[PDB]
Protein backbone atom coordinates (compact mmCIF):
# COMPACT_ATOMS: atom_id res chain seq x y z
CA UNK A 1 0.00 0.00 0.00
CA UNK A 2 1.24 3.35 -1.26
CA UNK A 3 0.60 6.70 -1.37
CA UNK A 4 0.72 7.85 -4.85
CA UNK A 5 0.95 11.78 -3.98
CA UNK A 6 3.38 14.51 -3.53
CA UNK A 7 4.62 15.97 -0.64
CA UNK A 8 2.43 19.03 -0.21
CA UNK A 9 -1.02 17.50 0.21
CA UNK A 10 -3.16 19.30 2.05
CA UNK A 11 -6.99 19.02 3.32
CA UNK A 12 -8.08 20.43 -0.53
CA UNK A 13 -6.92 17.49 -2.98
CA UNK A 14 -7.97 13.90 -2.67
CA UNK A 15 -5.35 11.86 -2.30
CA UNK A 16 -4.86 8.62 -3.86
CA UNK A 17 -3.23 5.44 -3.08
CA UNK A 18 -2.36 2.10 -4.30
CA UNK A 19 -2.38 -1.32 -3.61
CA UNK A 20 -1.63 -4.88 -4.43
CA UNK A 21 -1.76 -8.35 -2.98
CA UNK A 22 -0.32 -11.40 -3.86
CA UNK A 23 0.22 -15.07 -2.32
CA UNK A 24 3.78 -17.15 -2.70
CA UNK A 25 1.78 -19.68 -4.60
CA UNK A 26 -1.99 -19.75 -4.71
CA UNK A 27 -4.73 -18.56 -7.09
CA UNK A 28 -7.63 -18.24 -3.94
CA UNK A 29 -10.05 -15.45 -4.06
CA UNK A 30 -9.19 -13.32 -1.06
CA UNK A 31 -10.96 -9.88 0.06
CA UNK A 32 -10.12 -6.65 1.19
CA UNK A 33 -11.21 -3.36 2.79
CA UNK A 34 -9.44 -0.05 3.86
CA UNK A 35 -9.38 2.00 7.21
CA UNK A 36 -8.99 5.42 6.92
CA UNK A 37 -9.35 6.23 10.40
CA UNK A 38 -13.05 6.57 10.79
CA UNK A 39 -13.38 2.26 10.50
CA UNK A 40 -13.34 -0.09 7.95
CA UNK A 41 -15.22 0.07 5.19
CA UNK A 42 -18.57 -2.71 5.89
CA UNK A 43 -19.33 -3.97 2.56
CA UNK A 44 -15.83 -6.46 1.96
CA UNK A 45 -15.30 -6.54 -1.91
CA UNK A 46 -13.75 -9.02 -3.92
CA UNK A 47 -9.89 -9.06 -4.68
CA UNK A 48 -9.81 -12.18 -7.89
CA UNK A 49 -5.80 -13.57 -7.51
CA UNK A 50 -4.12 -14.05 -10.22
CA UNK A 51 -0.95 -13.17 -10.50
CA UNK A 52 1.36 -15.21 -8.20
CA UNK A 53 4.96 -15.53 -7.04
CA UNK A 54 7.29 -12.77 -9.01
CA UNK A 55 4.21 -11.50 -10.63
CA UNK A 56 3.34 -8.25 -10.01
CA UNK A 57 0.78 -8.10 -7.27
CA UNK A 58 -3.00 -8.00 -8.25
CA UNK A 59 -5.17 -4.21 -8.98
CA UNK A 60 -6.88 -2.87 -5.82
CA UNK A 61 -6.73 0.74 -7.15
CA UNK A 62 -9.37 3.52 -6.98
CA UNK A 63 -8.64 3.93 -3.63
CA UNK A 64 -8.62 7.72 -2.92
CA UNK A 65 -10.04 9.67 -0.09
CA UNK A 66 -9.72 13.30 0.93
CA UNK A 67 -9.34 14.47 4.68
CA UNK A 68 -11.24 16.81 6.64
CA UNK A 69 -8.61 17.93 9.23
CA UNK A 70 -5.12 18.41 8.99
CA UNK A 71 -2.44 16.42 11.29
CA UNK A 72 -0.70 13.12 11.13
CA UNK A 73 -3.13 10.56 9.72
CA UNK A 74 -2.92 7.14 8.57
CA UNK A 75 -4.16 4.50 6.02
CA UNK A 76 -4.53 0.48 7.00
CA UNK A 77 -5.38 -2.00 3.92
CA UNK A 78 -6.67 -4.99 5.69
CA UNK A 79 -7.56 -8.49 4.16
CA UNK A 80 -9.42 -11.32 4.71
CA UNK A 81 -10.01 -14.91 3.47
CA UNK A 82 -14.25 -15.23 4.33
CA UNK A 83 -17.19 -12.90 3.32
CA UNK A 84 -18.40 -10.53 6.35
CA UNK A 85 -21.99 -10.88 5.71
CA UNK A 86 -24.17 -11.50 8.82
CA UNK A 87 -22.06 -13.27 11.29
CA UNK A 88 -19.17 -15.51 10.01
CA UNK A 89 -15.87 -13.88 9.60
CA UNK A 90 -12.62 -15.21 8.56
CA UNK A 91 -8.63 -14.27 9.42
CA UNK A 92 -6.57 -11.28 9.20
CA UNK A 93 -4.12 -12.82 6.33
CA UNK A 94 -2.08 -9.11 6.25
CA UNK A 95 -2.87 -5.84 7.14
CA UNK A 96 -0.43 -2.91 5.40
CA UNK A 97 -0.20 0.52 7.22
CA UNK A 98 0.62 3.82 5.60
CA UNK A 99 1.15 7.20 7.59
CA UNK A 100 1.39 10.95 6.12
CA UNK A 101 0.81 14.51 7.39
CA UNK A 102 -1.91 16.48 5.89
CA UNK A 103 -1.35 20.09 6.10
CA UNK A 104 -4.64 22.12 7.08
CA UNK A 105 -5.78 25.20 5.81
CA UNK A 106 -6.35 27.91 8.35
CA UNK A 107 -8.62 31.20 8.06
CA UNK A 108 -7.79 34.90 9.18
CA UNK A 109 -10.34 37.16 9.75
CA UNK A 110 -10.12 41.43 8.72
CA UNK A 111 -13.06 43.29 10.73
CA UNK A 112 -13.82 47.09 11.01
CA UNK A 113 -16.51 49.14 12.35
CA UNK A 114 -18.09 52.07 10.03
CA UNK A 115 -18.17 54.91 13.07
CA UNK A 116 -15.11 53.19 15.26
CA UNK A 117 -16.65 54.27 18.25
CA UNK A 118 -20.76 53.82 18.15
CA UNK A 119 -22.40 56.40 19.90
CA UNK A 120 -24.21 55.87 22.70
CA UNK A 121 -27.30 55.27 21.25
CA UNK A 122 -26.98 55.40 17.41
CA UNK A 123 -26.32 52.16 15.47
CA UNK A 124 -23.20 51.07 14.64
CA UNK A 125 -22.45 48.17 11.61
CA UNK A 126 -19.00 45.85 11.78
CA UNK A 127 -17.95 44.74 8.98
CA UNK A 128 -15.76 41.63 8.67
CA UNK A 129 -14.07 39.51 5.99
CA UNK A 130 -12.27 35.95 5.96
CA UNK A 131 -8.68 35.52 4.29
CA UNK A 132 -8.10 32.19 2.98
CA UNK A 133 -4.77 30.28 3.89
CA UNK A 134 -4.42 28.78 0.13
CA UNK A 135 -6.06 29.50 -2.72
CA UNK A 136 -9.85 27.35 -3.05
CA UNK A 137 -9.24 24.61 -5.59
CA UNK A 138 -10.18 25.22 -9.10
CA UNK A 139 -13.80 24.91 -9.35
CA UNK A 140 -14.97 24.63 -5.72
CA UNK A 141 -16.91 27.32 -4.00
CA UNK A 142 -16.57 27.63 -0.18
CA UNK A 143 -19.45 29.01 1.78
CA UNK A 144 -19.38 30.27 5.43
CA UNK A 145 -22.20 30.90 7.55
CA UNK A 146 -20.94 33.30 10.12
Given at each position: ???????????????????????????????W????????????T??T??????????????????Y????????????????????????????????????????????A????S????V???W????????????????????
Amino acid sequence: LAKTTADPVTTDDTIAFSAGAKHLSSTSQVWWTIDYGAGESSPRTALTMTNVGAAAPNAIASLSNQYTSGGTKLATLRIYDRDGVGANTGLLLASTTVTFTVTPVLYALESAVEPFSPIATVAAKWSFRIQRSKATPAGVTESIKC
